[PDB]
Design a protein around this ligand. Structure first.
Ligand SMILES: [Cl-]
Ligand SMILES: [Cl-]
Ligand SMILES: [Cl-]
Ligand SMILES: [Cl-]
Ligand SMILES: [Cl-]
Ligand SMILES: [Cl-]
Ligand code: NI
Ligand code: NI
Ligand code: NI
Ligand code: NI
Ligand code: NI
Ligand code: NI
Lengths: 304, 308, 308, 308, 308
């Protein structure tokens, strides 16, 4: 089989559509998500045109091997999609309607800067390579883009599944490549964070505020690294900094500066000066909660 | 091959059945379970009808490629089911009886609100897409729905495996689609929870409460926090972190306040008696010692009222 | 191809055998084990009979597609076995001798009640479904059941690999099914447990009692709780959490009560050495110091009587 | 099919190119990375040559089975690449242009000596075995070597993707083998290390010294060891344990000596003042309080000079 | 296809060779290693013999399906090898030369008794089952056994890759089986251990002795058990739990007795001086402070004599 010949010179337009059936396994660490969807393709092949009056049939159904089908690939997939052809239908004018159900593991980067109050745009890039006979270009059939109502991504709210209607046409290894960007929009159900993560990690910090203070103020450090290890499956370590990987470098400083204060107050009163000891070791007791609110509100202004 | 032609205009009814052979790997985190079952399909294809007297046989056996077979798919599966055709039998009137043994990883959401005293309804959705030649509809053959007696799901009690007999017929991308809902009902085996998880998490906070009867309050208070997060680390494989709140997500969130209010009490009592007032020190440190166990069950009993 | 026709009415007997080549990955948590074995099958197909005088040869070798072969399946497997046909030999009477080497992931429940001093019977269930032409029944050829001497299952002693010679014949979805039970008996090599798990779990309970002899009782008594959960989660990969109770899930829950009742004492003795009651303080704090090693000895021996 | 015959004697030159589409899963522990790329191959096959005028076509497209294609393999791959042929184009002189999109798991050793300030050269080795008919040699078509702009490797900066243009030709099992070295060069994003890994672990060493200013020094000095190993376990997923020594494996090793020599000082100063000598006690306990931060900076700067 | 007929009665000799291309994933817990190698096979098939002057060709290349090829299998593999035929060459006398590149997950037991100063012999067992027509025996072609210079096994030193030249011929299920033993010899790069595991594991229970010089000894001696069990969990990925005992599984079990006997001495010295006897208190508390490092030195040297 060879591609449909052009009537003039025009490129062959392959109309596309993705209908999400399932979305699952959004792996934050691997920056992948699995998808199970319908992929619909439409193109005109005049060599397949027929007379409806003489044939008596409105539509003809073909086997994938019997006709020419465009080689559509996904850009950002780990391995090639697992695809099962559902249907191939040809109208009398020769317009082919292709439908396959596929599953794929998609590579899509995630921006964790605003975690756990972040929103993401997951991408599914469709691509086609041109043949020497003719150029193949991709288009979006908005009637065939969508999602099942039951599509659930645990811990996320699904907002929209849209496609950037204009393909990105470019040359790659001396041939044309037509790329479409399908985008799935999500937002984190951060409701849970306060209850289990935000509040109890803080009730360790808050519990951090003379030789007995050495056993007291150092525990709220040993337990902070245990809340960390005890819930690290929900804390992200990025190559850059997050508004939470910063709330982390602040708790580490705040747990230190508190034990710098209680290491200076219990050493100033012992080095013959107990007058100025109650001057800084009472002011830091109202200074810390306000130095914190100011700092966390200063951090918040930048990132979120 | 092409679908069987309609005698009038009627859609083709494909009778279905799922017989569970094995149920395994209920992954709470991934919200998946693996299934190994028989899938039975029945439909009328008049083009295959024969006379038993002339043929000499009462049944005819075909190879899947030799005849038309409906494209049945599962909705909520990770990848397509691994299927092996067991048998294809045709009766004299053209009634096809199809049987395959398949294995599949099923996506089925779990409600953890009542964990570990929860019950779930796992779903297996069967679906068929209609052809331009004719409309295909699914039906349940209750005689071919069931489960092996040996079907075991470790940590769960299997109640029932039934099917919603009425399919959900709907249009999708300009074609009819027929969807059936097979439901496997399961309740949890919560017996174990108290023994190793529920009771020992309490025997740390009761050991925070047996120090309200001081500098010793630090070594008894600040420890039954460090050890609570260590049972919470040491038994996290049994504790679920959901996007919402569970009756256990809260039953552990009350512990975070109770371990704090306990060290707010012992941070106010050991600071009031030191600031020249040891009279009112024994007034709050002694009532909080009988106040905490009653504030607790009142709270845990208040939580229990809403979730259960 | 179609099944061999019956001479009278009698079902077709398919003689079976499993020869274990490798046993590996006994996953206690998943309750699976992987197997690599030979599967031998024998049945009489008179249509394949030949004269050794005329054909010259005493045996005919066939390709799987060339002849009829019974569809033999495993019941308790996650997915279908990865099989490679080694040989198909047809003898003059028409007796077919089939041999394949397969590998499979087997689902076999494990009883952890006596862990780590437990023994198990792993099962491999062979099954065949009868066809419309005739009924198929399975049999055990004891000459073709066995295991390689090198078959090793790390951490276990392999006792025997036998088959229940009588198949379980039953009806399933309007057809006959013939099921054979192959059993691999294995026992646990518990020698290691004392050295790395049992003894140090105890040198923390023992070191909690070596402090029942006052402000130092706070630092000791509570540490041998924080360290107990560290030996636990520090070696949890060797401790099983079942839906039911084990003599080890019980051994580890008595420690939770003994670490608590040990800090019910260190809290009463600290309340008695104060609150103007010094006398009766040395009456219970000294008696509990000889009471518990024996209250423990009695309890663990009482537990042992029930389970093992 | 057979290889193209040589016009004189010359080996068949197969021009190669790898264009990276995706790079992912750089597994530091397994020393693997996954790749998804285009593989382009070009060679002259005169038997496929044609006249463009007489044929009416300027290019001829073939199916992989229709023509001879060189068996190109990757040396350092776990299993064989998953490949999908995109295009096969033949020009009038019979120059074949082959293009496939493949995915592969690549084995490439990583040097962790300078972690987290390390740079790596990941390799992809292309290889071809010669046939008896003729010798096949590999070449680099620099026009077909490259990477997509979007190629991202999380936690790494991608420097260059080049190929060593000269193949390594050698004999292996009585035939010639031609090997090309494709090098994807990378470097880390060490900015993050200070914030979350380097500084908090250092704050523990710093807070161990903020106690060199007597029985309370035992409870304070030993905690910043218990917490040191908790920062370690708490962030071990970012700390590498190699078969050799890393400047960080040494930086972690210096902390083990500095946390010991710190509690050797606080075990000698709190024992000298108690053994009737409190004069010389303030001589070493005060000098070590300004000695440690400078003995550390000197040591870490001495270590740094060697490795990085 | 059928096997080559014997000229007299002699068994067919299949000459073998394995050339290692890659060695990776030595999984200590699973007792597996992955291999990627060439497998070469040679046997005489007279039916394929040809005249060199008449044919014009000195070698004839065949497709695997075109000729008879011996079914060679690996004994100790999880699943069957992933194999890709590279070349099949026939010499005029009818000597076939077969070459395939395969990848396989090999089951090979590991002896951890001397860990981390252990050496291992990994095995790859090649096997052939004889056919009814004739007996097939395996041989080693030492010219075709070897390994690539780049073959690296992370954390191990590769010593040699040799084959036991004499096959183990035996009967299995009424047929002859010919088994060859290929051995890859490796040793552990134990240099790492001192740095990260060896010296720091000690410094914890070395720091338990730096407190045998009284009420502070309660707080210091007991957190040592808390930190040791954190150094252990903190580096458990490098400590092996075997069904048997090691020079390490004991080295870590002596520490459990030494961390206890340490707190038995402090549970006796800090209780004897308090129970009106402070004379004999300085007699045993000072002697145990020089007794422990020598009782340890002796014990570790006594242990060493047995195992290594
Ligand atoms: Cl794809
Ligand atoms: Cl499916
Ligand atoms: Cl079979
Ligand atoms: Cl099977
Ligand atoms: Cl082979
Ligand atoms: Cl194999
Ligand atoms: Ni498929
Ligand atoms: Ni299958
Ligand atoms: Ni196979
Ligand atoms: Ni190739
Ligand atoms: Ni492919
Ligand atoms: Ni292959």
């Amino acid at each position: 089989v060879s591609p449909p010949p052009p009537i003039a010179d025009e490129p062959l337009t392959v109309n596309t559509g993705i209908y999400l059936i399932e979305c699952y396994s959004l792996d934050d660490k691997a920056e992948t998500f699995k998808v199970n969807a319908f992929l619909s393709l439409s193109w005109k092949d005049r060599r397949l045109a027929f007379d409806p009056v003489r044939s008596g049939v409105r539509v003809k159904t073909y086997e994938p091997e019997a006709i020419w089908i465009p080689e559509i690939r996904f850009v950002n997939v780990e391995n090639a999609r697992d695809a099962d052809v559902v249907d191939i239908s040809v109208s009398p004018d020769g317009t082919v309607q292709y439908l396959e159900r596929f599953s794929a593991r998609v590579l899509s980067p995630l921006d964790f800067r605003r975690f756990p109050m972040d929103s993401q745009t997951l991408h599914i890039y469709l691509i086609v390579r041109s043949v020497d006979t003719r150029n193949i270009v991709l288009a979006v059939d908005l009637e065939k883009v969508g999602k099942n109502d039951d599509v659930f991504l645990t811990g996320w709210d699904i907002e929209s599944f849209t496609a950037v209607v204009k393909p990105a046409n470019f040359a790659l290894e001396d041939r044309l490549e037509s790329k479409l960007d399908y985008q799935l929009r999500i937002s984190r159900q951060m409701g849970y964070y306060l209850i289990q993560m935000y509040i109890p990690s803080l009730l360790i910090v808050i519990l951090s505020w003379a030789p007995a203070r050495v056993g007291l103020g150092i525990t709220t450090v040993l337990t902070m690294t245990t809340q960390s290890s005890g819930s690290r499956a929900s804390l992200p370590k990025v190559s850059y900094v997050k508004a939470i990987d910063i709330w982390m470098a602040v708790c580490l400083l705040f747990v230190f500066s508190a034990l710098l204060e209680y290491a200076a107050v219990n050493f100033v009163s012992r080095q013959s000066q107990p007058q100025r000891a109650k001057k800084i070791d009472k002011i830091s007791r109202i200074g810390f909660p306000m130095a914190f609110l100011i700092f966390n509100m200063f951090y918040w202004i930048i990132y979120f």
